[PDB]
Symmetry: D3
Subunit: 260 residues, 6 copies
């Protein structure tokens, strides 16, 4: 058992259900540690497919990165050991398919989390927002790259620059989702596909998944390029605007961004 | 003439029609060698556009890899000079547009083959499946990469991990196909597009096709990461599951995969 | 302040309107130089979003490359400091979002230009063509790469090899456009989004845009592959077909290409 | 304790002495497994510097690959989890400096092993050979890469194509070695340098070592190039010459190579 | 004129002489800002070659990083816009040859600075060391890469891991220096070579220098590798050892490093 | 038989001797075409090693590029299919070792040509110069890269920026040469080594040479960086200085370069 997730097994399929509704399944360190422990505990030959879900009837699938766990300024908010950075790597390297089964609204790092998973099947009422520009956070290269493998650049830029929610129907049309189903059909539609995958050759699925992962990451740059980007990110996490974005969230008010 | 293909030329357009229906146009070496010779023989200045097709009324466009040519020994059947690997390189490097004109069901290696071509125009009743997880085959990096340039990562993973067929209408919606036409209109729709292309500048088409080819290949990795993937593939070829997948297909029974 | 563009500032949004309609906003050096000056002049903290547009009611958004500036004797017109190559770099490096708000027909280099921008919102009557195979132009690697980040490879090759126009509805369906609206709604829809973006954290927007730019460019190749492609491009520029394509456009007649 | 190595710790320096004289420290699996276990056991905060050595007075440092373990069947003997391949990765990823202290003759795989280490200090009488062309072995990319970071290409090609031994004085002159010492001063000299390194900041040493490792490995190629090299290597291990080289080595006779 | 450098021009050669002897030409921001202003001022077609030198008779060429300008902990000490990072880029991108003419001892960042120049001519009495491990500084990837284009990996690792000085004779032997000459001959020898270079084709020198720069930079990696390295560097600049290294330098005592 | 070379084979070693002394073995197209034909003719299983040499007693091994064949019209003289560019690719791809056996002075493109070969054995009286800065030629990326795999960057920049000759002794010290011998020992020493190599496994030598070639080329850049370099090289071939450099050479006087 786990404090912040609940696991059920049906034949060869494991379903990991978030249990952190008190913070709307925000990706806090202690929540992600339990999610990672539950995945590791399910890395055995008789489990063939994972489903990630929020509880049935959830308004909010996940509120994204825990804003309270972001640093106050002057520190990189999305360093390699950050919980969002850990969970996306672990999903992508996990040698079984991971299906995100989505009911409710999806925010920021939770949208990156489901994008990092293998398939996304969603309720017709689910919504999707990418929100770091609401807070002034300099998103990291790996995080942004994880958003670019489904929908086109123009679509990704609209999502990130507007931070406006999109419907499940629009997320299907642009290539983000695999399927959209009525919420009463979501569980059994997802499980039917997970059990079907579970009869296929797991060692073949694992090596093809890993081949896709390394091909997806195979956009290479030189050290100077990376250090230049990192210096720009540093100017953002050093900015007055970053402090304003954090404070506006704390004070539950609209931020006033000024470009320094 | 050719034993396993038929070629027709209409001014600047050449049609290469499969003639291997006895074996559902399975990608046997003798068939691929004839397709490659026919293409090589059409690399002439007065030919400007190629169409690949199965015969009119075909239920099966191509059944994919020939099971009888798949070595149960160590030997990787997706090594550099295996016929499927040769013909996808040849299609990609060919200095004229190649249009796949699809009637019937497309499977496995034959799906990769049409994905390697420049345009796909399909009958409304055509269907598409990617099948190596049905046999436990560790599909090779180049081969997987060839499936990633049209539909997004979530869609590709659904196709590969489920091995479930999709309709022409879904293949159009996700970006695999250019056009879906009623079967009675397929040949004329495809020919008029090929004749139209054939009035454009062939040297410009050739260099822009080659620029697209090298940009599409330009996902680069270090030697250690390639050798690490090859070790994983060899472990799949050495598995009990790989033996079970091939024997099950030969014996017409459901495989029992166990994950070693 | 500018001969060939008009600028209007509405709160934090700047609308740059083409003023070269007597040449259908063809990408003449004098026009592109004024566009780049007006954009540079808008790189100030109190400007948060840019819209590029043709005048209200335009039949032609932009006619693409100016034929009279296309060099006969040798010179690559798609060299690093040619105006279209300069303006696409400037648009992609500009630290504010740039929305192309499209009314009318978009051709060739102007299609690349709007594809280089962050979002494209188009009138339901707008049309889109990529035309270099009409003239035998060997379009350059960077220019072709700029066309590959939205729609898939099969679609891009149809657009380039046919040089046929596509509707706004098809451009939306394949992932090229963000939104298609009735022409009467184009300003309201586009400005509402631009004002919304202008509420967000500009430094986070700038660094994410730059991360996407560098990831988009991170398709790397060795020097030999680049030099090989440049030799193929030079052979097209030296071709009789290239002379025929320019002469036919200048004489308002159908080119007859011969493959040398 | 270990069957095949002896470990001595002197404050922050650990000396791992080979104890496989029975087979002249040939890189047999049982010897390399003990060497890797000993290194792993020494990955502790209070150890700062490792020395690898053969016993004092040894005429042979290491005879290289155990040829009774290079399979004359079909399998690649330089696959990712071959002992030589494992030990070079472990040495390069180890977060402390590893110094090869060499007395005696160094052969083939043992030469690659010391080249993968951080520093090489050698007796004036030690000799160095790289021997795969004696046996017809298609050495792997990673393995060859590990020989290219010290001496220039022409020097490396002479070593590999001739398989001739070089002196310690020549190995110093071409940049393979750090220092050449009289044999009676070898241990004192090496330990003095190891104790000195051990006074420096270990976390800085570890991150700079890892920075050099990844820069060393950052020669990137596409999947097709790697698969093309893989197919060339398979042709070599399938050759008559490969069987002849292994047999001639086992039978202590000169091989007769014929180019197939 | 400049507070912290003296410039003389002799025909087409400019000599930039350090004037910061009271701080042993440590790389303080005020010194580097003046050196960069002097270089920019000399980017003129009548200047063909630059010499960087310390005053005649200098015991210390440069004491390297100003440790009063090292941030205290929690902050990256070698960010993109830090003075040493700016001057190495500026040296590398400068379209004229820059010759480091070395008299005296060279330390740490000053060693990286001369390595970033095009040629190094040194007095027989000059000495060179690379010192970050003395303080626990996590040297950045670009800075380490600048140290790897002359001497081999084993030699570079000895220099960095020991922080021990090498002689001009050994620096010549391992490929760091171009020439070593008696101090009395140093100015005349270096000026003769700079005048010689100044009669060659400056635009050919400039493009070949730039080709070398981008080839030297062209070791590429994926974003995850870069961010993993940055995470490791941050753990070092967050360490108690980093604070102890800085404190011990300011208190003029031997540090006690413990590995956290 | 060949007009511009003489070939002698004994056993498994072929010697290709230049026969173009009346033009100092200048790299004229007719000479390089004959060298490439003779190499192609020797790509037979019973030939195992090639030696390239000038006749015994040659003062000039090769005068490099024929200045009569360098275009003054605005054509790149180092385009992909230039004879020097062809022969360096052919030497590097050739599946046998190629030894340059040098007597006499080596200039410009001939220096690149011997650097592209696998080993260099030289007379003690031989000399080496790299001269494009004498004529104002913007040497191409591939050609510069071919000069960077033996000596370090500082040495390479001295050779190129000074265009000054270096002795065989210095060429040996800096890592360019394998061996320097007295001229009366040059044939015997080189034949001994070539016949020794010919007793080794040719398929292993061929695949290791190809692995080295691919690793050597695996310095990758994005399209924008290559196109930016191309633009710089074009500005050099459009220069007053490039005309002055070719005119001075034809008129047998010193050029006056001005930086335009
Ligand atoms: C990677 C990354 C990110 O993920 S940044 C985080 C992005 N997340 C978001 O923008 C979502 C922010 N939250 C919201 O928009 C709204 O809270 C939701 C999710 C729509 C829910 O709206 P509701 O009206 O139902 O609930 P409510 O706002 O009242 O929130 C319920 C409680 O959870 C808190 N909360 C919500 N989202 C949170 C988050 N992401 N982190 C920490 N606390 C959070 C909120 O402050 C409140 O605290 P309180 O109990 O002390 O007042 N990044 O780079 O920035
Ligand atoms: C590098 C490169 C090139 O340089 S291609 C060079 C030619 N450009 C293209 O092919 C791009 C596609 N554009 C086009 O096909 C044509 O411009 C359009 C869309 C059909 C429209 O041409 P139309 O003949 O209908 O134009 P219309 O008659 O309505 O012409 C209205 C006015 O615009 C002028 N004009 C139209 N297109 C022009 C162009 N591409 N360049 C210069 N002037 C143009 C035309 O001369 C006339 O002015 P005038 O009255 O002073 O003479 N490339 O990659 O393709
Ligand atoms: O559509 P189709 O199947 O007819 O093919 P396609 O138009 O390429 O055959 C070329 C025709 O489309 C026209 N066209 C090309 N791009 C266009 C665009 N962006 N908007 C409107 N018309 C365009 C082109 O000038 C030519 O007109 P024309 O009728 O005067 O020849
Ligand atoms: O030039 P060389 O004539 O020295 O080359 P060669 O390969 O013949 O090598 C001279 C001898 O040194 C041997 N050898 C190879 N690598 C060696 C090493 N690291 N240390 C000592 N001897 C070595 C090689 O087996 C040959 O043995 P053998 O005499 O017992 O047959
Ligand atoms: C990576 C790679 C390689 O490393 S190829 C292998 C390269 N190694 C060699 O050529 C060296 C092979 N060994 C020799 O040349 C000679 O054994 C030595 C090093 C010169 C010394 O000659 P010695 O007269 O002192 O000793 P000797 O040959 O008797 O060898 C002493 C003992 O070790 C055994 N032995 C020596 N080299 C061995 C090897 N490479 N593999 C397995 N056993 C080996 C040998 O069979 C004998 O065992 P036994 O008692 O059971 O018969 N590759 O792929 O090419
Ligand atoms: C890039 C990088 C680095 O550069 S690492 C640190 C690199 N720097 C070094 O390793 C140099 C360490 N400094 C020294 O060892 C010594 O100061 C010198 C160069 C070696 C020589 O020994 P000396 O006995 O001559 O020192 P000296 O007594 O001559 O000191 C002469 C004057 O220069 C000042 N000074 C010397 N080194 C300094 C430094 N690193 N920073 C600031 N001021 C310095 C010092 O405070 C004094 O000024 P003051 O009179 O106003 O107080 N990195 O990452 O590590
Ligand atoms: O050879 P070494 O014995 O000098 O190695 P080691 O690393 O001990 O350092 C030798 C001595 O030279 C000093 N040193 C370091 N880099 C130096 C350089 N480029 N020039 C002169 N001395 C240097 C170092 O501080 C030490 O002085 P110290 O006496 O104050 O500790
Ligand atoms: S553009 C790449 C640049 N190529 C080079 O830098 C090679 C430069 N060549 C030289 O420095 C010298 O010409 C050589 C190599 C040292 C040899 O000098 P020598 O005193 O032995 O003979 P000399 O220069 O007089 O050369 C005898 C003849 O060969 C001609 N020649 C020499 N190198 C040549 C070359 N690379 N291309 C064409 N002609 C050349 C030279 O112009 C002279 O012409 P002529 O008979 O029509 O008057
Ligand atoms: K201006
Ligand atoms: Ni990509
Ligand atoms: Ni502590
Ligand atoms: Ni390199």
């Amino acid at each position: 058992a786990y404090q912040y997730v609940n696991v059920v097994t049906i034949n060869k399929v494991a379903v990991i259900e978030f249990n952190y509704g008190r913070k709307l399944n925000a990706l806090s360190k202690v929540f992600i540690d339990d999610l990672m422990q539950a995945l590791s505990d399910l890395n055995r030959p008789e489990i063939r497919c994972i489903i990630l879900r929020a509880p049935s009837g959830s308004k909010v699938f996940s509120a994204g990165h825990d804003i309270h766990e972001l640093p106050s300024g002057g520190r990189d908010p999305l360093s390699y050991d950050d919980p969002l950075r850990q969970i996306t790597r672990m999903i992508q390297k996990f040698p079984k398919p991971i299906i995100s089964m989505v009911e409710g609204s999806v925010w920021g790092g939770a949208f990156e989390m489901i994008m990092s998973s293998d398939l996304i099947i969603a309720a017709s009422t689910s919504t999707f927002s990418m929100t770091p520009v609401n807070l002034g956070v300099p998103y990291n290269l790996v995080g942004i790259h994880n958003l670019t493998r489904d929908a086109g650049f123009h679509i990704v830029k609209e999502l990130i620059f507007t931070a406006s929610p999109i419907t499940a129907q629009r997320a299907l049309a642009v290539g983000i989702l695999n399927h959209v189903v009525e919420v009463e059909e979501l569980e059994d539609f997802t499980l039917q596909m997970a059990h079907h995958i579970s009869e296929k050759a797991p060692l073949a699925i694992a090596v093809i998944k890993e081949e896709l992962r390394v091909l997806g990451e195979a956009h290479t740059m030189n050290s100077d390029e990376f250090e230049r980007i990192q210096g720009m990110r540093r100017a953002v996490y050093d900015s007055e605007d970053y402090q304003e974005g954090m404070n506006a969230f704390l004070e539950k008010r609209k931020p006033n961004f000024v470009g320094h």
